[PDB]
Amino acid sequence: EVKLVESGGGLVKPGGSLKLSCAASGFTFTNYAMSWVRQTPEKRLEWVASISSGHTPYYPDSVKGRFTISRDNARNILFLQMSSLRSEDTAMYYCARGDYYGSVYSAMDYWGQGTSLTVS
Amino acid sequence: EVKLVESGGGLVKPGGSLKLSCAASGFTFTNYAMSWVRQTPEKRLEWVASISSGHTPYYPDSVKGRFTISRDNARNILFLQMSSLRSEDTAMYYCARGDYYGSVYSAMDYWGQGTSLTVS
Amino acid sequence: EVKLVESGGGLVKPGGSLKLSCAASGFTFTNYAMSWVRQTPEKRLEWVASISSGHTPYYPDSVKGRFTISRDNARNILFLQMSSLRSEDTAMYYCARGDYYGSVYSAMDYWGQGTSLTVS
Amino acid sequence: EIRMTQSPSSMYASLGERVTVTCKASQDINSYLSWLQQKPGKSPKTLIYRANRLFDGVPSRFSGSGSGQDYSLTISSLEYEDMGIFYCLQYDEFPFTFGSGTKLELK
Amino acid sequence: EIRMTQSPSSMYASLGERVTVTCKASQDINSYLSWLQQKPGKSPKTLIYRANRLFDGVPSRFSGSGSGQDYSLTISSLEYEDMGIFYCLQYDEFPFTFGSGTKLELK
Amino acid sequence: EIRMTQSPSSMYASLGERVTVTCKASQDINSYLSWLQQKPGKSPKTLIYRANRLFDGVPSRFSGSGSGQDYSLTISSLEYEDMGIFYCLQYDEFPFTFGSGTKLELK
Amino acid sequence: AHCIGITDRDFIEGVHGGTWVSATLEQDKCVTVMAPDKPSLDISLETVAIDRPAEVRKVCYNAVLTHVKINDKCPSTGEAHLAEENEGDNACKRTYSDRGWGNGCGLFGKGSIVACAKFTCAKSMSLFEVDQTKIQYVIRAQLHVGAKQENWTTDIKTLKFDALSGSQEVEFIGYGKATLECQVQTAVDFGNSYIAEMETESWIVDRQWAQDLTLPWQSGSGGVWREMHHLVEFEPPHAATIRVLALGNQEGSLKTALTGAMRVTKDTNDNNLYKLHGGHVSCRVKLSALTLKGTSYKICTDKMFFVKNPTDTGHGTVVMQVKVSKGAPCRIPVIVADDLTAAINKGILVTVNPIASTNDDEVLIEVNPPFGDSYIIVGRGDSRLTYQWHK
Amino acid sequence: AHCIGITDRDFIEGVHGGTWVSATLEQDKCVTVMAPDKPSLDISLETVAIDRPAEVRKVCYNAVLTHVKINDKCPSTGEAHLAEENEGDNACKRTYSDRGWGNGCGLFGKGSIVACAKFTCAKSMSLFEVDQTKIQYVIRAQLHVGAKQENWTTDIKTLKFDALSGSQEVEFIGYGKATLECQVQTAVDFGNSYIAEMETESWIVDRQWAQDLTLPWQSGSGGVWREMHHLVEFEPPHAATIRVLALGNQEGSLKTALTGAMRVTKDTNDNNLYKLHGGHVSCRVKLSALTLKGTSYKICTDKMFFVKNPTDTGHGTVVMQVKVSKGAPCRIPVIVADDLTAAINKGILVTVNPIASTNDDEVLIEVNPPFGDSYIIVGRGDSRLTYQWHK
Amino acid sequence: AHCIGITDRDFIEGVHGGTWVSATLEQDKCVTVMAPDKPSLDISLETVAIDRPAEVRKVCYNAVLTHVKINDKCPSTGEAHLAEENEGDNACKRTYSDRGWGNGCGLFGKGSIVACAKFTCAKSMSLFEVDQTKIQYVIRAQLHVGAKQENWTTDIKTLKFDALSGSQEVEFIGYGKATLECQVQTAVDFGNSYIAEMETESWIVDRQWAQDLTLPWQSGSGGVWREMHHLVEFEPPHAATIRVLALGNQEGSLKTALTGAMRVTKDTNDNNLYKLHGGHVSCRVKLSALTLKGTSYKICTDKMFFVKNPTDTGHGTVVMQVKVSKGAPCRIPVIVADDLTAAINKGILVTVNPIASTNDDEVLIEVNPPFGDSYIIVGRGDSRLTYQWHK
Ligand SMILES: *[C@@H]1O[C@H](CO)[C@@H](O)[C@H](O)[C@H]1NC(C)=O
Ligand SMILES: *[C@@H]1O[C@H](CO)[C@@H](O)[C@H](O)[C@H]1NC(C)=O
Ligand SMILES: *[C@@H]1O[C@H](CO)[C@@H](O)[C@H](O)[C@H]1NC(C)=O
Asked: How close C80 comes to chain E (CA, Å)?
């Protein structure tokens, strides 16, 4: 009974910093792996981050160093923390759920309800 | 012939405490186990407590730590002490005698005249 | 593209005997199992016999000892031999091919044109 | 954690009738079972315990049977002193429990 | 000798309809189950060789799924060229056996 | 980086229709490819996860197809519940990519 | 016939006349008996078998402890008893615990405790007695004049024996008659033993081992189990409470120990049969009424050829198979020579006098060529056909 | 109070000036510490507890086999191979075998056979690793000032210790405060080991031992069992058939092998914690902050009656229950003496100043008389009570 | 002139009783045979041939890896797994490896990692097993009657031998008959081995070698490779990253190792029939029924010309070719002698009685002179031809 929940969108000035949080239930959270995906105002899609079971991260060059992913087994919470936001960073964002073996190498089975983020 | 006699019920204020006292005669009181049961005009019967010939107590979880049972082998009196009475606990009460092994696990074949305890 | 050809049908007296024959084309024949099935005017199918890439048979007890199956890989041919034919055996018959490996344990791929045998 | 429950919650009868009651249990009771009667405004009394056994002084007209999760009590002929509430009582696990019981009436 | 059975004996259908044949088995056959089709005047044709495995050139409208001792063969939209006779065929045990066979007609 | 393109930018379709959106890739991925649907204002949904494999509970009207660098999604019969956006997701190498989605609308 | 296919073999050679000839047989192997003028004869076992065994014991090897009851008594007033202990199908143990004022009793002496539990078996090994008069043997025989091997399943003859049966008469149609005498006085011992079954894997076992198992056991139908005190264990007491534990399935231990004995099985068809491995038997045979067929026929003249080349097999004989195009009902001469130039034979035929009946017919032949190298030769005149061969 | 009923007890005395005292604790025992003018303490050890361990392996001790398959190839060509061997749910084995003309092969010699079957587990042991950083100790203590046993559960205090905290500042009404320091993580052996669960039964053993069990095992989720052969046995092949059989349950053998280790248990009724049997710890205690409630009360003066006669204990010390008739709240004198003239006191009280709280309530007094016979005396003046005693 | 042309000629002579003569043949060698009354013969081995052997193994010696997948887990859990491991096309390797705060996971120690890739094959060595009864030997035979070079490829006879035809007749028009006896099935020694190919270059090798090369292999059609480790070498890991390194293509190492095997040619102009070098055979020949043609014809009398002059050819024999001018079929006498008085023919002739059929024929003549000085003389009387020679 998968449940997956957003929190923390809004507006931030260029050169600020921010973090977002998601909560989930219905499965033992340490046996799965997680991803973050963004949808532009033009409705194009871009993958931004994922993290394996364990704690190893991966990123594309679109993001490298500017913002970062982490996970807490204690709270069943996923976090995304951002710095030096640019104008292109305004989008809809969703967290998404990995697969039973915990490698990032899989298709993705469920999607959060998501939030916008805005810049001026 | 066996006889059974009842006393000590009445009316008391919530948060109070009282001890009931059953008196019995006509049988070798050292041997048989005995137990307490309570009833309401709402037909559901409730088991209260039970005691071994070895004085070992037994209680249901809803009253653990609240009710206490004890006995006197010279006076042939059964004492049931009740503390922190509640609107949760208002009924007709009965006392009854088990079988000659004095083990707790058996039905009961003699029953007292009974009396009420109530809370206001 | 593959084909199977299938011959020897006709009429036989009860208690008589007959050999049916089949030949194969379009594929290498030493590395497939083969089998026989029957069809009847009640339209209910039955399995008749099968042979491994090992020269070993299997039979159902409904006809065990009456028939024999064998291959001849020097000619890419099957021989199906029956003795003491009985009225129930009057049928349409088909040969068929197994799959890449020598076992009989598989589903079955391609089917003969059919030939008829009649008992009277 | 034992549930026992009873089907004929409002059945009533008339003089000399054959009458039967029955109960189901959430797990095997292994025959540590019994049957009791409540008369209005008086002390309850026993009838039967275990596998269809009678205590002394119980009249012979009472009977029953059961096993596993399924049990029954029945009377060979109903008589007016039988008016009251039947109850079932089980005692194989230390949280002892009764059924809800049912009332029998003459028409 | 294991026995196996199909729900529709003979059944009418409409063009473009979705149609399903349930099959039930007397034991768990571990998905060694296959489905064959025939049309009159011709030798049979194989379509399904394991549950949701297809031969080359099978029309994509065929599918079939299940586990254990119950299975389903399914079609999303009937086509007149595809209509005819269907058979299920298990192949786990030492004695191989077909199902009943089932018949379909376009009303 | 693996580039892909969904060839039909948009299509107009009706109930009962077959629709066959196709995609082409810059590399022969090992079929690590999946199809996503989104309905306006809702969270997206995943249907086909390996190149022809389908989640639990999802309706049977879809199937996938292709090999190497050529693939397509077929809906065997379109229904009102499924108009909207499709996206073609590949996951073979570290830079994941979605191509550009395409619109299917009831005509 | 089939004695060419069996893996391990020996010959045995008689002496001229109506003398008895003697053999010994082990379940997998076979023997072919030879005598100077007679056609040759092959025999084999097929099985020992048992029927209508008798039940003697059930031994229990997994159990469950479904319900428990306990109660206590104060150290002044002696022993205790509980209503359950009266009933025969229940575990019981009695012991002394601590007690004192911290537990509501008048003195600090050692108390008394009783415990009881509802025992039952869940899987049982069943033991059977074998009635030694009832064992059966079945024997296969074939006269080795030979035919294409597909005929073997219909030509082969099968025989039954028991301790009451004496010598046994047999026929071979067109060749005469023979007689066997398997001494049922010869067997491994089935006294002092039982047959053990657990779940369609089964064993011969010595009675002492069966008696020595400390597992719980039962005398027959119904009854109550005898020694649960070996299988159920109680942990040392707490003040008014005890716990009791199973030792689980013992199965693997028992399964390990039985590896020291012959294996046994039950058949799927005519399921009354029990089928048994590992014994051996001895028999004597009478050959006098056997005869060589076809001696009056002409020698063949026409051309002929192999349908299968001669080939090796592990016994040391070769085998080969032949057909005849248009010959009469006639005999085929076959022989081996150290040089193709000379007729002086050195080898031995093991099928003695070949016959072909008709143009459709075929024959199967085996010989033992001399160690060294040689030519096999078949036919005479221009038809003469040959093959080169080695040790 | 608490200590009096336990099977075994230590007395320890601190000479004035030893402001730190130390003592050792075991699960089944307790200690009373005593200091010359301070009310006495009982220290007692309930349990060692563990919370939410780490899951690391599944080990299978029984297996069931099904859907057998087999395949066969002749001596002259290839080797045995079969599609089912790929899917991880199967066990597999491969061998050469006998073959020959009795079957169909063209040449005599060894052929090859392959066989495999589906495998599934019925009952599996789970292994866990443990967080040394999260073990918990639970200790019970209370002051010994006289109080009737029927109230002890409300007067006991309970403490929790772990790697986070040293002594609590333990508080009591009237009497003052105290401190207990614990040597956390001084168990005989911990780490290097796994907790094990069977069905509702448990064990602990070193992490090296489990590697040497030849039972099949799985690591983590989503894998499949490895080293798989050792539960499954194959008979030697017959001509085209192999019979495959399980060694059945190993459970009883496994349960045999662990008997030298410490027992363990779950209890779900206490919210899924694990509790460890048979441990021990060492601690240090400071008494100095305690005070005596009674010191300012008057001496008693009046008639008094026993509620229980004195009685013996396994500790060699006496217990009695006393009640005061009409007096003020007061203190009751106690002495033990050789002569009823009581010129001297030969012995010591366990509770250093008994208090009569108020009329119509009970008191405990507990006393350690010398070797040899002597008199106990309670009360004073002509009403004084007496009871003779012997060693 | 094949007996002349091939270089390592040997000579054999036999007693004129028709006693057996025997020789060993080897592909580089030729043997010519003589007995004094009868015209001389040569037997020479052409080739050993094998037809359509059995395909057993494909062995892959160069390979490429197209994808990498990796997964990792911290010291908590022990080995993880990755879903791709159940697709048999993939190779795998695993290890425990370091982790820490530098890479996010929360405890020091060893975690574990797994890596996979799919496999595929570039070039594949094939192994086949020879089939004994499909061997053929072939032998060339010629009589030294001395026809022109232009006629050799039509006069030559091309015999075949195999186990089914252990001896054979050669028939020569006007010269009678002779017989050859081969020994073709010398032993089982030509077994024990596989015939192996890469692309048009090919070898024979012992099975005991082929079974133990570490390269990956698979048997028969379809399938997926096994023992797959040895082409896929994994880098010692860092920080949950691994370079999967394809080991180098082995080909040249393998081809170098084979050097001691004899060579094979997959000639597929001759119906894919395999040709084998290095053959080795032994044989008997019977000379009895050879005869001499034309012996009583006229002695040749008119003028003659040399057409290829008398020439050395290294075997010590000298060779010449001559044309007759006129007349009938005739016989040409030859002697080689000390002195032109021609008192005795000193040497030996390898053509016994050369003749011509018509005056526009030509003939070869060749002789072995005595050691040292001699005249060679042809014809009789007037218009003889003569020549001079040494050793
Ligand atoms: C037995 O062999 C003969 C040939 O000798 C053959 O004609 C006959 O059919 C065979 N037996 C049977 C039952 O077919
Ligand atoms: C025991 O508990 C009762 C609770 O009402 C209290 O009145 C009494 O003073 C207590 N006595 C002691 C000695 O703790
Ligand atoms: C050689 O071959 C030629 C071919 O024309 C033929 O004329 C001639 O007679 C042959 N001579 C011999 C000796 O075979």
From this structure: 18
